[PDB]
Design a protein around this nucleic acid. Structure first.
Lengths: 30, 391, 35, 24, 87
RNA sequence: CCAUCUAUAAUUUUGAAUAAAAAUUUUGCCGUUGCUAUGGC
């Protein structure tokens, strides 16, 4: 269900070159 | 002699009209006739026609008056306006605007029409649609007289401010088109009243007014540039506020469409000399809380290099500093890292302000003090990866 | 209507998003009934 | 008695627009 | 003179609607820089929401009082049309 | 707190002049009495 939607969404993003990923916000550390 | 007789006569007219018993009060006798279904309609028409002649007569004396007799005629007029209700008042007075041939009487007639709606509610909606259509129709005719041209716009502004949303859409779209044309009027008063009407119409319509956006924002920006040149205008403070309040109205209602013209908004705010700093500094705070902070940061660099840096204007510099510190203390971490190359490009320019500044040492050292505290806040709220190339 | 006269590209898209976002909810419900 | 007396005392919006027009 | 009074009234009307707390229409430069910077925070801490509420209540009472006056005057006249319709 | 830098005030140049500009450095309130002094609360 939800996995199938992501697979379809991944195929959609795969249809074009989208391949978008969530950004990661880092902080001053170490 | 005669004047003493005149003073006593209007006291005599005042005593009769004064609402000191059902049979005694003239106001209650009129309303019962309206209630009575069996009362002939032709009799109701006479009451409407006779009231208009009475209202015009008292305005004629007030217009052409003597301090004591002036006060009495206002006592008499106050009694007259309460004789019949709002529904019949609008029917019995609106036709009289076209009929009346005196500039003064039509000026007074438009004020009283607006006053009746001050204390009304949503029951007056069908009535107000009638009033608005009449006022819109007379605006082309009354273009010659500035005072009447101004007053009709002011009443329309009040009627659109109060229960304006519930008015029919055609009137609102017709009123906005009228204002956009009258902003170009040569008289400053018509500009101020037209700018006030656009602000209220845009508030009611919201996004639906985007069709008129090319007729609102660009002409206003040119109007501001002309406002600076004519510093002798006695209404210079009111005009610059009106242009400023126009943007404040549409910074709250259409932020996204104004993101493109945000630079010209900031140009108006900084260099609006006549307006008080409180008014200017308040309309900044709308921009931060309503417009994307990424675009403001990009525009703060262009405005500084082009205008503020060479302005040698104290209030403009301080207002720029207030915008820059508000943006950084509100801009989130994700936007701060993305927009970092722009901010540091601005930062080097702010550091070099000492070379070109015409101010004395204390000012520049105070300006730099704020530049350093914002830079620390912005360098915090970043990470190693983005800042190492910038360092 | 969407106005494209005397408006830049960014302003036009804002009109598109508001129109399409509202229509998406009703449109999606329509396909579910049809399906 | 005078001392007691000293203690005793111790214890239209449209209208404004119109006349401006007559001045004008 | 009416030209000036009408312009101020219209503008003052917008200030109340959009910027409630802001006032209406009626030295060293380093000092001037600070005052604006201090004005920024103290304007931010103003309780405009309380200012809007007071204006709404003041208007609401007057509208409410006027509404009762219409209601009461209607009843007195309604009984009279009733009275005469009997006779 | 001190110093430093400003601000205010003063002499000076262009200047009929305004103007800029280098430059430098007795009462809380109420009276009376002078041109300063003392009566009431």
């Amino acid at each position: 269900x939800x996995x199938x939607x992501x697979x379809x969404x991944x195929x959609x993003x795969x249809x074009x070159x989208x391949x978008x990923x969530x950004x990661x916000x880092x902080x001053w550390x170490x | 002699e005669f004047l003493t007789f005149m003073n006593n006569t209007f006291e005599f007219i005042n005593k009769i009209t004064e609402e000191t018993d059902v049979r005694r009060n003239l106001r209650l006798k009129v309303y019962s006739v309206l209630l009575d279904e069996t009362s002939d309609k032709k009799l109701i028409r006479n009451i409407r026609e006779e009231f208009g002649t009475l209202l015009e007569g008292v305005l004629f004396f007030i217009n052409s008056v003597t301090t004591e007799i002036k006060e009495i005629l206002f006592k008499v007029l106050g009694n007259v306006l309460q004789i019949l209700p709002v529904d019949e008042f609008v029917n019995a007075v609106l036709p009289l605007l076209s009929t009346s041939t005196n500039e003064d009487i039509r000026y007074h007639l438009t004020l009283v029409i607006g006053s009746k709606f001050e204390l009304e509610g949503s029951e007056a909606i069908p009535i107000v649609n009638n009033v608005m259509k009449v006022l819109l129709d007379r605006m082309p005719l009354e273009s010659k007289s500035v005072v009447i041209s101004q007053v009709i716009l002011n009443t329309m502004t009040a009627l659109v401010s109060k229960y304006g949303k519930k008015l029919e859409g055609s009137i609102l779209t017709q009123a906005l088109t009228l204002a956009t044309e009258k902003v170009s009027s040569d008289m400053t008063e018509v500009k101020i009243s037209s700018l006030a009407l656009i602000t209220n119409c845009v508030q009611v319509l919201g996004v639906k007014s985007i069709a008129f956006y090319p007729k609102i924002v660009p002409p206003s920006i040119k109007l501001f540039d002309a406002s600076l040149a004519d510093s002798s205008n006695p209404l210079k403070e009111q005009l610059q506020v009106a242009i400023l309040l126009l943007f404040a109205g549409l910074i709250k209602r259409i932020p996204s469409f104004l993101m493109s013209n945000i630079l010209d908004v900031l140009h108006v705010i900084y260099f609006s000399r006549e307006v008080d700093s409180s008014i200017r500094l308040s309309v900044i705070s709308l921009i931060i809380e309503n417009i994307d902070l990424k675009e403001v940061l990009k525009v703060l660099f262009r405005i500084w290099s082009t205008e503020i840096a060479t302005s040698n204007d104290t209030v403009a510099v301080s207002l720029f500093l207030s915008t820059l510190e508000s943006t950084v203390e509100n801009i989130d971490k994700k936007s701060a890292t993305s927009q970092s190359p722009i901010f540091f490009k601005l930062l080097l320019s702010l550091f070099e302000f000492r070379s070109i500044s015409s101010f004395d040492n204390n000012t520049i050292s105070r300006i730099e003090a704020s530049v350093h505290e914002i830079s620390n806040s912005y360098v915090l709220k970043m990470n190693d990866k983005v800042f190492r190339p910038l360092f | 209507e969407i106005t494209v006269d005397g408006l830049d590209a960014n302003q036009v898209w804002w009109q598109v998003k508001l129109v399409l976002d509202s229509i998406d909810g009703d449109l999606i419900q329509g396909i579910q009934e049809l399906k | 008695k005078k001392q007691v007396e000293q203690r005793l005392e111790f214890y239209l919006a449209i209208q404004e627009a119109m006349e401006l027009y007559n001045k004008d | 003179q009416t030209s000036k009074y009408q312009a101020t009234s219209v503008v003052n009307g917008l200030l109340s609607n959009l910027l409630p707390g802001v006032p209406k229409i009626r030295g060293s430069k380093a000092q001037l820089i600070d005052r604006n910077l201090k004005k920024r925070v103290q304007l931010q801490n103003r309780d405009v929401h309380k200012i809007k509420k007071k204006c709404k209540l003041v208007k609401k009472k007057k509208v409410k009082k006027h509404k009762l006056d219409k209601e009461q005057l209607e009843q007195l006249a309604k009984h009279q049309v009733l009275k005469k319709h009997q006779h």
